[PDB]
UniProtKB/Swiss-Prot annotation:
Name of the protein: UV excision repair protein RAD23 homolog A
Role summary: Multiubiquitin chain receptor involved in modulation of proteasomal degradation. Binds to 'Lys-48'-linked polyubiquitin chains in a length-dependent manner and with a lower affinity to 'Lys-63'-linked polyubiquitin chains. Proposed to be capable to bind simultaneously to the 26S proteasome and to polyubiquitinated substrates and to deliver ubiquitinated proteins to the proteasome.
Species of provenance: Homo sapiens
Signal peptide: none
Classification lineage: Eukaryota, Metazoa, Chordata, Craniata, Vertebrata
Entry superkingdom: Eukaryota
Domain Ubiquitin-like: 1-78
Summary of subunit composition and partner proteins: Interacts with XPC; the interaction is suggesting the existence of a functional equivalent variant XPC complex. Interacts with PSMD4 and PSMC5. Interacts with ATXN3. Interacts with UBQLN2. (Microbial infection) Interacts with HIV-1 Vpr.
Shown segment, full-protein numbering: 1 to 78 of 363
Compartment list: Nucleus
Effect of mutating K47E: Impairs UBL-UBA domain interaction and enhances ubiquitin-binding
Name of the encoding gene: RAD23A
Protein family membership: Belongs to the RAD23 family.
Recorded domain comment: The ubiquitin-like domain mediates interaction with ATXN3.
Amino acid sequence: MAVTITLKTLQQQTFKIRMEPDETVKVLKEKIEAEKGRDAFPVAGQKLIYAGKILSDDVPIRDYRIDEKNFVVVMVTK
């Protein structure tokens, strides 16, 4: 009974990834990266931004309260 995250790159792209607030975000990286690719959002540099703060693959999605109603920004170094 997972939720539905919502991500958004640099405003150009906006999507969502079921996932769950429990996972360490890394799993999300795998999904989002599966949507775009290792060129668009490689799990490596797949950084996310919730409430102006940053979140890595090792941090919990719950730590950033990344709920469906909200969306985080998937920024990746480039």
